[PDB]
Amino acid sequence: EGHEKADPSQFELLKVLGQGSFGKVFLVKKISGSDARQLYAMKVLKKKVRDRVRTKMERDILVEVNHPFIVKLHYAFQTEGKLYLILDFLRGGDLFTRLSKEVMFTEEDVKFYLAELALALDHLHSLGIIYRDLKPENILLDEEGHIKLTDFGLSKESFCGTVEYMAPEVVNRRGHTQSADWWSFGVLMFEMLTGTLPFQGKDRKETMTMILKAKLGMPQFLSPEAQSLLRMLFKRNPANRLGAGPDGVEEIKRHSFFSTIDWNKLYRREIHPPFKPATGRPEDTFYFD
Length: 289
Ligand SMILES: Oc1c(F)cc(-c2cnccc2-c2ccc(N3CCOCC3)cc2)cc1F
Fold this sequence. Notes:
- There is one protein chain.
- By secondary structure, the protein is of the alpha+beta class.
- It has 2 domains: 8-87, Phosphorylase Kinase, domain 1, CATH 3.30.200.20; 94-267, Transferase(Phosphotransferase) domain 1 (Transferase(Phosphotransferase), domain 1, Orthogonal Bundle), CATH 1.10.510.
- The chain has helices at residues 95-102, 107-126, 168-171, 179-194, 204-213, 224-233, 249-253, 263-267, 282-285; strands at residues 11-19, 23-30, 39-46, 75-78, 82-87, 93-94, 129-131, 139-141, 147-149, 154-156.
- It is globular.
- Bound molecules: ligand A1LU8.
- The site of ligand A1LU8 has 15 residues, from strand 1 and strand 3.
- It is found in: Nucleus; Cytoplasm.
């Protein structure tokens, strides 16, 4: 079932990439079909979630999601109390990891990732999907340098998550509109530029409290544009935030900050990424001569 029909005997398990509460990730290689020898990430989850006296696989949200800068569910299948999602395998690492090293990114490097993330978030909003936990660990990089949002945070719009990226209405549990996603957009931006989270205290309590009332002082090494965008993104009324309006994402798009960005070339991955990441493949690991 899923996006394409497939079974266990059509995949070859190579590694376990990681393991969490959600389930367990594998590196796998397709053995059948036209894409034989194509590497994938196999996410397998313990079948838990269920409603209306039927086990509802709410990883049916990836069916309609198809976009350059988002992960695509290639195949899917359930098997003896486990659901198996096959997704894109990205070998550039997180954007968290690069942040941990570089500390802060050039305004042009940030402009890039945000712009591609903007397109991603718009696509999801066009399907009525919101990204709960928009932290930097969810934004993976491909070997080119372009991004890909993971599916972990996906959820229909109609409590938990890293509190720093959470928006004020979400803290008060007033509902997770798509305006919340643009707040986290603001956080990711502030963080990538300052190497620091805009709201953070001694504990999760104080941090949440600060999100609600604590006035933020703009770091004055940020350009007028970057400041402008942040000030607009960080508004505690969701309806007054940038993005939450008639135009939608065009508000974000037509801003001084992105005034260098060719959104058509960006989409077609024709604009060059700022940083090419390292890969596990022998090309990037070996020494030479
Ligand atoms: O749902 C997805 C998935 F399961 C995997 C990947 C993915 C694709 N290429 C390379 C690495 C990964 C990847 C590997 C491990 C993790 N984690 C470790 C365990 O706790 C959760 C986080 C996350 C991502 C992408 C997805 F969207």
